[PDB]
Design a protein around this nucleic acid. Structure first.
Ligand code: MG
Ligand code: MG
Ligand code: MG
Lengths: 152, 152
DNA sequence: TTGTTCTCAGGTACCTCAGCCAGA
DNA sequence: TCTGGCTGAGGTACCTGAGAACAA
């Protein structure tokens, strides 16, 4: 577990509050027992002309990737243990996105339980709803209600 | 000549680097001696639903104003003295917009010279050009080139 | 002749989803 | 079945100007 420098976290927390994204998704997976896969992602988006800033980020964080789309690029971190570690350290410093970070931490922490039971899974799906509500959500599709597929 | 907390400055620089803007403008004015007026702005933009964040900024910075148009708000600071002080303090922590901050500080400093002579004014105008070039400039009309209306 | 406040809006550069597939 | 790497894209929420007017 990497300990991040405080000043780095303070700047990043500001930059994240601006161009960053803390995301929770419920993906429909036919293979999964509950028919859905959870995904948690930390994203930082920037124009591709500036991707070096993102490339540096992979190095400083120590995990993750930069993906490129023509004009715009993103830093993405999805791996759960590194994500929990980085967010734990970030969240004290966030303002706009502090609650989202706390919710993500909660979900991850409760993941194993969530896997052993439909009920524990649905509760946890509600948390995802909460993160989406907090975010500027515009294109969302699958929610905890969709997870009434479990009622069938 | 307020002195700002370093932790606050670190967070804000990251935020400014993300959602913020450092703007230099040349505005054409007949009443002006060289026929244009120079403007400098520091802005942070956010959705009005989050205006509370910007209002907080006026309190923390202690100067400047918040404005709404449509469904987004802008924190703005233009007063040159306060702008010079704030930016002098902010600039060490900026990464993306560090040069723009410095170029602005220099322009302000050379203002008295800018007034005395046209050739001096014109050079100060070129600095404005650099700032705009650094920025993601998309709608700029008036330039150092426009300022060679000084051909009269 | 200058500085500053206040409003407006073009064109994205972000945000925040969606989804598929390889591997263990 | 589960997770982590990868790509695609809708709908703004930003950025970064413009300009008119008030106040000296
Ligand atoms: Mg933002
Ligand atoms: Mg940005
Ligand atoms: Mg932004």
């Amino acid at each position: 577990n990497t300990k991040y420098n405080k000043e780095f976290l303070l700047y990043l927390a500001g930059f994240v509050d601006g161009d960053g994204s803390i995301i929770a998704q419920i993906n429909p997976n036919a293979s999964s027992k509950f028919k859905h896969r959870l995904r948690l992602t930390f994203y930082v988006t920037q124009k591709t002309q500036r991707r070096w800033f993102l490339d540096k980020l992979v190095d400083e964080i120590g995990v993750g990737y930069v993906r490129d789309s023509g004009s715009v690029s993103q830093y993405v971190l999805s791996e759960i243990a590194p994500l929990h570690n980085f967010l734990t350290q970030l969240q004290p410093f966030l303002k706009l996105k502090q609650k989202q970070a706390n919710l993500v931490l909660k979900i991850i922490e409760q993941l194993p339980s969530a896997k052993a039971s439909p009920a524990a899974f649905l509760e946890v799906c509600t948390w995802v709803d909460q993160i989406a509500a907090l975010n500027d959500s515009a294109t969302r599709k699958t929610t905890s209600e969709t997870v009434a597929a479990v009622l069938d």
